[PDB]
Amino acid sequence: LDPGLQPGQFSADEAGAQLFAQSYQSSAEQVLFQSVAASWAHDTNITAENARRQEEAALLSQEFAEAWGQKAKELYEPIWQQFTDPQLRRIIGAVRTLGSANLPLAKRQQYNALLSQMSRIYSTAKVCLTCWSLDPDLTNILASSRSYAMLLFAWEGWHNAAGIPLKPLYEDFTALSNEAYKQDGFTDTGAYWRSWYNSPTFEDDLEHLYQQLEPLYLNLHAFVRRALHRRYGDRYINLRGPIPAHLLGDMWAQSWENIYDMVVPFPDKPNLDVTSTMLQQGWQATHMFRVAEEFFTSLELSPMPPEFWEGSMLEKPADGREVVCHASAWDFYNRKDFRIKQCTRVTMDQLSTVHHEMGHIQYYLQYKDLPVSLRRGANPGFHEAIGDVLALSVSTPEHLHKIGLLDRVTNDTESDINYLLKMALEKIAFLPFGYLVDQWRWGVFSGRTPPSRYNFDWWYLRTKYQGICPPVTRNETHFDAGAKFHVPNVTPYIRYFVSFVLQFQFHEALCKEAGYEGPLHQCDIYRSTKAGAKLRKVLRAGSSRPWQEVLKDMVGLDALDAQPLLKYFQLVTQWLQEQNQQNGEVLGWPEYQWHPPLPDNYP
Ligand SMILES: *[C@@H]1O[C@H](CO[C@@H]2O[C@@H](C)[C@@H](O)[C@@H](O)[C@@H]2O)[C@@H](O[C@@H]2O[C@H](CO)[C@@H](O[C@@H]3O[C@H](CO)[C@@H](O)[C@H](O)[C@@H]3O)[C@H](O)[C@H]2NC(C)=O)[C@H](O)[C@H]1NC(C)=O
Ligand SMILES: *[C@@H]1O[C@H](CO)[C@@H](O[C@@H]2O[C@H](CO)[C@@H](O)[C@H](O)[C@H]2NC(C)=O)[C@H](O)[C@H]1NC(C)=O
Ligand SMILES: *[C@@H]1O[C@H](CO[C@@H]2O[C@@H](C)[C@@H](O)[C@@H](O)[C@@H]2O)[C@@H](O)[C@H](O)[C@H]1NC(C)=O
Ligand SMILES: [Cl-]
Ligand SMILES: [Zn+2]
């Protein structure tokens, strides 16, 4: 480690730790900058040379972590917990967590290499027969093909190409991750991930939330299953069984907005998917980013700086290079450079994704003056929810009309049902998947799920919560969990279930604060400077204070709460129950063993 980057001496006491943290921050900024730079160069341009570089950068960050980790222990182990300065306790708490820096050098190299290799496999896998990539090729197939056979070919090819080669790597990564975190005193990596919520009853709190949400999901599911039965017929849809996993519009069946045209109850009303209008008008990526920016400035939040426009990657490259297409937002830790990398396509759900990623940027802009350790969300769920909250105003029919995407606007109960059903396909359908992914991964890290049951345990959970089934037989050579971005890219998942709850609590608070006084689902906070100010107080806090207190100041409660999401959806909740009753549906999937047959000509 460079001499300039190494820790000095400080006293064993709180005045020293202040000097320590100032010294640390001053060093960490440079280390973070070089890591993030090398990751960027790789993620926008996957080459062996770029992976080697990113690995050398992660090694540097491990030596940094070890030297300051060990120094923070050596001087402050007995005293840090008792500091007067609350922010200074969280700073030291972060600095003393070693992670992968607990590994000896040889295993640090093996760990850094596994991260590179898993990311490469996921982002460069192809389905051939002349080869399709996930984004945009397979995405487009899953979204707009209605051919059982075609959709099967894409689903199977993807799962096979991405998952099978990842399995041995995934195994070796799990063992090394556990070895690293167990020397920080956690039972396993999953215990370390969970500890970010600082909540003794987290697992029980999530389960209580899920029990209140499950009836809405079960009713959406049955109604959608019926729509599918009418197109695909009795051979491929079982009205008492799980839904084939390839028929819901999306490679992971995790949100259903693309099959809106099959389920829309009142087709004579304004057409609420505005994608075709966007195309007709000639919208491009950069217009989408500008319209999103304008919503933020209407709240008196910050514009995107020059460095964001000059540095970002807003389309998939044409020049041949290979890239990580899954979207992400980048803080370089120098308080100057911030970027988005997104393979943006011109579609309405992609306009939402634009807002999602710009919400992360806005968080980085607001907290850029805190000590580097506090430059995070109050919890991870808060960071994921910011952009989603604004996207809830943007997609209201009235807002779409203001921005030239919807010609007529109607205010009547049929238009409301359409609206709430479209939003349910996006928000309600997701809930079971958002909850299950880390139940799977926590079982793997704890050893409850060894490599010999990775796929068995994955499909148990897929069926149990989502009520889907794989459309072809799977076995333990398949590794279907690894065909989802966040698994090989090692991004925790429970943050999204938390986010999907929190965003409705935020929405309700900012609508009240804006002075809005009609139905929660018709609220648009656009141009409300009072709403902007309340949002800004959250963003400016970073992780400097407990999330339960940040939440209470914002919404008036110190806990996650399903009530706002339930109030938003109330009208469609009631309507879907009534429809399913009148149609004699069976809620749930009692025929749990059922799978569809192969088509005659497969493949
Ligand atoms: C779309 O329409 C709804 C429904 O509006 C009501 O019903 C219609 C059949 C007609 O009778 C309307 O003339 C009538 O308002 C609109 O929601 C309603 O908005 C008003 C405010 O604009 C709400 O009234 C307020 O009530 C609070 C206390 O709750 C008072 O302090 C205020 O002074 C104010 O009068 C009314 O409750 C609300 N109805 C609800 C909640 O269902 C809706 O705003 C409109 N949407 C759009 C986008 O225009
Ligand atoms: C993608 O990454 C490679 C490095 O892996 C970049 O290639 C280097 O390009 C510079 C300038 O053209 C040369 O001096 C080097 O010799 C190249 N290295 C090689 C080929 O090993 C490439 O330019 C990157 N593409 C971008 C940034 O668009
Ligand atoms: C696992 O499955 C592999 C791929 O074949 C698939 O499984 C058969 C049984 C069909 O029903 C269909 O889904 C696919 O063709 C096999 O090649 C492999 O041998 C299977 N078993 C093991 C232990 O890997
Ligand atoms: Cl998380
Ligand atoms: Zn995100």
Numbering used by the authors: 1 to 129, 135 to 608
Question: What do the authors report?
Answer:
Human somatic angiotensin‐1‐converting enzyme (sACE) is composed of a catalytic N‐(nACE) and C‐domain (cACE) of similar size with different substrate specificities. It is involved in the regulation of blood pressure by converting angiotensin I to the vasoconstrictor angiotensin II and has been a major focus in the development of therapeutics for hypertension. Bioactive peptides from various sources, including milk, have been identified as natural ACE inhibitors.
We report the structural basis for the role of two lacototripeptides, Val‐Pro‐Pro and Ile‐Pro‐Pro, in domain‐specific inhibition of ACE using X‐ray crystallography and kinetic analysis. The lactotripeptides have preference for nACE due to altered polar interactions distal to the catalytic zinc ion. Elucidating the mechanism of binding and domain selectivity of these peptides also provides important insights into the functional roles of ACE.
